[PDB]
């Protein structure tokens, strides 16, 4: 059974260097024709190929990121490291490492390359956020079938929890995923279609707020 | 570089349907193409490798065919776990490109969004910023277009939106869009409008308010 797992810092500041480590088991990077690659996925976006390294140590990089990427392997530790320099906010994404099969062999002789056409096993992926922001609690503003809600603005880092009427209101509630503003702070809205009070809690900064919203 | 275009980008279906997703590459990639299914919060899972080979442990309802520039993945009898996003990947040329993906969601009848516009709170204004938010509630299909207009000027680059995941009982989506301006710019205009285009609306709906009108 092959398994891979990514590790590294969940938060990194612009211009800084990001080092991600892929630790694996079930195969060796000394095995014939094996490869380990890296793929990223910005929230809500498509998959983006980054780089790959093979056991014979051949390396290949995304042309768009070539200058900022370095991939290396430590065969004895069963790890592959990807170093990305001068990161910026657009680099926030979930990063995955993955295994690429070598060709099928018979008596140590490759007879089928078909198996190399895919990345067959993936790691759970690691979420990396790039922001120069320091921990900060949200400002909560009112948003007034009728609809009303709360705007949970300018907080960092994720996540924040929102409920209505201390958990008594669930029907018609929609808490949207936060967006990372250009300022480096998150912002989200939570509405409800129908007293109404939103209970906001941002654990990181120990900021609890109950805001009653009316017409 | 090489381009991999998936079609359709989004697709509605019901349990039991037969669906087919297609992927076209700009240059021939021989048989070096793989298909993956990705469930939210989970990593992509390999379904088909080398264009048509069934990956071990993957259910038989999945099938892949094609070579060169046109490939297709078909699920013969859709199961609930198949409501997800699918991706194709090319491995003939470096970089090893991925397609834009195609989202497969639960089909339901068309529903137009209930639209609401919210002016910024006086509390926010005192801090020097103005957030105008527009809500599109419980609609289907997922594709919707929001256009902000201030005193008839079409806004650009100053808004952000996010969409909820499909509702488990409703099968509808909801969308929130925030227009952000400095208090100063906010004060220099009167008509803040949220224009919404959607399949369920005969023509675009506009919800608006005049600033300061009390």
């Amino acid at each position: 059974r092959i398994t891979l797992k990514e590790s590294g810092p969940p938060l990194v500041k612009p211009t800084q260097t990001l080092t991600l480590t892929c630790s694996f088991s079930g195969f060796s990077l000394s095995d014939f024709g094996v490869g380990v690659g890296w793929i990223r996925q910005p929230p809500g976006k498509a998959l983006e190929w980054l780089a790959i390294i093979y056991s014979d140590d051949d390396k290949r990089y995304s042309p768009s990121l070539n200058t900022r990427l370095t991939i290396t392997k430590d065969t004895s530790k069963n790890q592959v490291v990807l170093v990305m320099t001068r990161v910026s906010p657009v680099d926030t994404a979930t990063y995955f490492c993955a295994h690429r099969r070598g060709p099928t062999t018979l008596f140590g002789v490759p007879i089928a390359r078909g198996p190399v056409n895919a990345m067959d096993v993936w790691g759970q992926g690691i979420t990396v956020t790039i922001s120069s922001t320091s921990t900060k609690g949200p400002s909560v503003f009112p948003l007034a079938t009728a609809a009303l809600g709360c705007l949970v603005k300018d907080y960092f880092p994720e996540p924040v929890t929102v409920s209505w009427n201390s958990g008594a209101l669930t029907s018609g509630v929609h808490t949207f995923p936060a967006v990372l503003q250009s300022s480096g702070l998150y912002s989200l809205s939570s509405v409800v279609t129908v007293t109404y009070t939103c209970n906001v809690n941002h654990k990181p900064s120990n900021t609890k707020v109950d805001k009653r919203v009316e017409p | 570089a090489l381009q991999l275009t998936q079609s359709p980008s989004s697709l509605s279906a019901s349990v039991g349907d037969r669906i087919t997703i297609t992927c076209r590459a700009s240059q021939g990639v021989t048989s070096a193409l793989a298909w993956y299914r990705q469930k939210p919060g989970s990593p992509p899972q390999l379904l088909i490798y080398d264009a048509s080979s069934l990956e071990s442990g993957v259910p038989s309802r999945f099938s892949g065919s094609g070579s060169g520039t046109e490939f297709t993945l078909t699920i013969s009898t859709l199961r609930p776990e198949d409501f997800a996003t699918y991706y194709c990947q090319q491995l003939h040329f470096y970089p090893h490109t991925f397609g834009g993906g195609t989202r497969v969601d639960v089909r339901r009848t068309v529903a137009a969004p209930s639209v609401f516009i919210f002016p910024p709170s006086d509390e926010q204004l005192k801090s020097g910023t103005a957030s105008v938010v527009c809500l599109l509630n419980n609609f289907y299909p997922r594709e919707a277009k929001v256009q902000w207009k201030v005193d008839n000027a079409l806004q650009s680059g100053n808004s952000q939106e996010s969409v909820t995941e499909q509702d488990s009982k409703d099968s509808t989506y909801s969308l929130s869009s925030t227009l952000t301006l400095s208090k100063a710019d906010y004060e220099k205009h009167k008509v803040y409008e949220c224009e919404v285009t959607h399949q369920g609306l005969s023509s675009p709906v506009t919800k608006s308010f005049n600033r300061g009108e009390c």
Binding site: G33, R60, P103, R113, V116 | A32, L91, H92, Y94, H96
Partner: peptide
């Protein structure tokens, strides 16, 4: 260029 296993 071409993949590792191309040709």
């Amino acid at each position: 260029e071409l993949d590792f296993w191309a040709s």
